[PDB]
C-alpha cells in the first residue's frame, strides 16, 4: 500500500536503494522506448498497433513514476527514520551506563 513493509534494517536500506535504482533505470529505458515509438508514430502519420504500443508503454512508465517509485521512496525514508530512532535508544542506554560507572567510581573514592 503505502510502504513495501520491510522491517527497518541496514540490509533493507541496501535492498531498497538497489530496488530504487532498478526502478529508475527501467523508467528511463521505457521512456526511451516510448519516445522512439512516438517519433515513428508521427513519421507514419500497422498504424493503430503503434498507438496501442505507446499507450501500454506510457501507462507502465506512469505507474513506475506515480506508484512504484514513490512507494519505494516512502519505504526508504521510513527505514532511515526508524534506524535513527534505534540509534537514539542505544545512545540513551550507553549514556546511562557511563553515568552509572561514574557513580560507582565516585563511591569508591
Amino acid at each position: 500500500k503505502d510502504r513495501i513493509e520491510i522491517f527497518p534494517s541496514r540490509m533493507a536500506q541496501t535492498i531498497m536503494k538497489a530496488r530504487l535504482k532498478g526502478a529508475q533505470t527501467g523508467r528511463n529505458l521505457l521512456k526511451k522506448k516510448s519516445d522512439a515509438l512516438t517519433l515513428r508514430f508521427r513519421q507514419i502519420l500497422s498504424f493503430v498497433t503503434l498507438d496501442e504500443a505507446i499507450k501500454i508503454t506510457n501507462r507502465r512508465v506512469n505507474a513506475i513514476e506515480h506508484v512504484i517509485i514513490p512507494r519505494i521512496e516512502r519505504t526508504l525514508a521510513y527505514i532511515i527514520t526508524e534506524l535513527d530512532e534505534r540509534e537514539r535508544e542505544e545512545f540513551y542506554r550507553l549514556k546511562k551506563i557511563q553515568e552509572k560507572k561514574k557513580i560507582i567510581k565516585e563511591k569508591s573514592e
Binding site: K55, R59, N62, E85, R88, E89, Y92, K96, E99
Partner: protein
C-alpha cells in the same frame, strides 16, 4: 496564608546545563519556586524539579548563563507557582512569565491559583451539546466545533494558520437560529506574528475581551512551557469561577514540544520518538484537557491549540500525541494553499469527535449528518480517481469516474474556498452540500437513506 519568613541561601552546590543544584536547604519542598539574584543584580526564578535530603535541583527559567557558585543568592518562596488572577486581566497583554508588558500595572489579584491546576471530576464534567458557528463551511459542515471541544488546526510552516485562527476569533458565533472571551498564548513566534494578532484583535474592536500572553522567539525557552498554563489558568478562573465563555488559542504547540524536548534532554529523561520525552503525552494532557463545560456552571472553555507539523509529517509525535488527546483536528495542507485556496482546509484527514452530538434535529438541520458523510465519500473517491487517472489517462475513465472529478473540482472551489471575510451560516453550508451532491444520481449517494434523499435531493 504563609506568615513565616522565607529563607535565603548562598549554598549553590553546582550548575549543570539549565539546572542549579543547591545544598544545605531546610526541608526542601517539591515543585516550589525559587527566586535567585546573580552577582550583578540580575533577578531570575526557577522551580525545584527534584529534592533529596538537603539538596534541591532548581530549573532556572531565564537561563543559567552568569549563575555563580559562591555569590549566587537564592530564596525559596515556600509554595508552588501560584499566580495572581483577576477578571480585569481581559484587555491586558502579558509576557510568558505572567508579567504585564502593556505599560499597565501588575495584576491586582482576586485570588491565587495553582498554575498546575487540578483535574476536573469526570462525574461533574458535562458532555458538550452546543455548536459554535465558525462561519467556515469547511468546518461548520463537515467538522463542526462544539462549545467545550478541543480542536487544533494541524498546519505547516508557511501556511496561513495564523489568518484562520484570527478569522475564527471574529466570526465565531452560535447556530442557535454571544461574546467569547479570548485568551491567546503567543509562544515561540516572531514579532510580526504577535503584532499581527494584536493588531487584528484591536481591528476587530474586541480587545477589551482579549487577554494576550506573549513569549517570542527571542525569549527564554523554559518560560515557553508555562505560558500555556498561564493562559489556561486565567481561562479557568474566567470560565469556572465567573461563568464567562472563554476561547483559548495556543499558538504553534510545536514550540511547546521543542521547549519540552530541550528540558527532557537536559534532565536525561527516557526518550520516546524523535527525542521527545516518554511522558510527552501526559504533559500534553495537562495542557489540553483544561477544557469543556462543568455541570452546574454556565461557563465553558474551548481550545484551538494550533500546531505546525514538522516536514508535513502527520505521524510526527507532536501532531500524533495531540491527535490522541484532542477531539480531532481541522488540518490544513500545502496542496490547497499552493493553488491560492483560502481557507486551505483539507477535510479528508480531519474529524470532529463531538461533531456527531453537535449536528441534527434540535441543533442545526436534520440532514446535517447525512450531507457530511456523503460529501466525505464523494470527496475521497474523487481523490482516488485522480490517483488512478494520473497513470491510466482520461480515456480509461467511465462516466462513474468523471462525476467524481466534477464533484471534486466543484467541491474545492464552492465548499472550501471562501475568503478571509466570507461568513456563511451552517444552513447555507448544507445547502451548498446538496448543490454539489446533486451532481450524482440517487443510486450513487449510498451514505444517505432514501428517507432523506426524497426530501432534499429534488431541490
Amino acid at each position: 496564608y504563609l506568615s513565616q519568613p522565607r529563607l535565603t541561601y548562598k549554598t549553590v552546590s553546582g550548575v549543570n546545563g539549565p539546572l542549579v543544584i543547591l545544598d544545605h536547604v531546610k526541608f526542601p519542598r517539591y515543585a516550589e519556586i525559587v527566586h535567585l539574584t546573580l552577582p550583578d543584580g540580575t533577578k531570575r526564578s526557577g522551580q525545584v524539579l527534584e529534592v533529596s535530603g538537603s539538596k534541591a535541583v532548581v530549573q532556572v527559567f531565564e537561563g543559567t548563563s552568569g549563575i555563580d557558585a559562591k555569590k549566587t543568592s537564592c530564596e525559596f518562596t515556600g509554595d508552588i507557582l501560584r499566580t495572581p488572577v483577576s477578571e480585569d486581566m481581559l484587555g491586558r497583554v502579558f509576557n510568558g512569565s505572567g508579567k504585564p508588558i502593556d505599560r499597565g500595572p501588575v495584576v491586582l489579584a482576586e485570588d491565587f491559583l495553582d498554575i498546575m491546576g487540578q483535574p476536573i471530576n469526570p462525574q461533574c464534567r458535562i458532555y458538550p451539546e452546543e455548536m459554535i458557528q465558525t462561519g467556515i463551511s469547511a468546518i461548520d459542515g463537515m467538522n463542526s466545533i462544539a462549545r467545550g471541544q478541543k480542536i487544533p488546526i494541524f498546519s505547516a510552516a508557511g501556511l496561513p494558520h495564523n489568518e484562520i485562527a484570527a478569522q475564527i476569533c471574529r466570526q465565531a458565533g452560535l447556530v442557535k437560529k454571544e461574546n467569547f472571551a479570548i485568551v491567546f498564548a503567543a509562544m515561540g513566534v516572531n514579532m510580526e506574528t504577535a503584532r499581527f494578532f494584536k493588531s487584528d484583535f484591536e481591528e476587530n474592536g474586541s480587545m477589551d475581551n482579549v487577554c494576550l500572553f506573549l513569549n517570542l522567539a527571542n525569549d527564554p525557552t523554559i518560560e515557553r512551557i508555562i505560558t500555556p498554563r498561564l493562559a489556561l489558568t486565567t481561562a479557568e478562573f474566567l470560565a469556572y469561577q465567573c461563568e464567562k465563555h472563554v476561547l483559548v488559542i495556543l499558538t504553534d504547540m510545536s514550540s511547546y514540544a521543542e521547549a519540552l524536548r530541550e528540558v527532557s534532554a537536559a534532565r536525561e529523561e527516557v526518550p520516546g520518538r524523535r527525542g521527545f520525552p516518554g511522558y510527552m503525552y501526559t504533559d500534553l494532557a495537562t495542557i489540553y484537557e483544561r477544557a469543556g463545560r462543568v455541570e452546574g456552571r454556565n461557563g465553558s472553555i474551548t481550545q484551538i491549540p494550533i500546531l505546525t507539523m514538522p516536514n508535513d509529517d502527520i505521524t510526527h509525535p507532536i501532531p500524533d500525541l495531540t491527535g490522541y488527546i484532542t477531539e480531532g483536528q481541522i488540518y490544513v495542507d500545502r496542496q490547497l494553499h499552493n493553488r491560492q485556496i483560502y481557507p486551505p482546509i483539507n477535510v479528508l484527514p480531519s474529524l470532529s469527535r463531538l461533531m456527531k452530538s453537535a449536528i441534527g434535529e434540535g441543533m442545526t438541520r436534520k440532514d446535517h449528518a447525512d450531507v457530511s458523510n456523503q460529501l466525505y465519500a464523494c470527496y475521497a473517491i474523487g481523490k482516488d480517481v485522480q490517483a488512478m487517472k494520473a497513470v491510466v489517462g482520461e480515456e480509461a475513465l467511465t462516466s462513474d469516474d468523471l462525476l467524481y472529478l466534477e464533484f471534486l473540482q466543484k467541491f474545492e472551489k464552492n465548499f472550501i474556498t471562501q475568503g478571509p471575510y466570507e461568513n456563511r451560516t451552517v444552513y447555507e453550508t448544507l445547502d451548498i452540500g446538496w448543490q454539489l451532491l446533486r451532481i450524482f444520481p440517487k443510486e450513487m449517494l449510498k451514505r444517505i437513506p432514501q428517507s432523506t434523499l426524497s426530501e432534499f435531493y429534488p431541490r
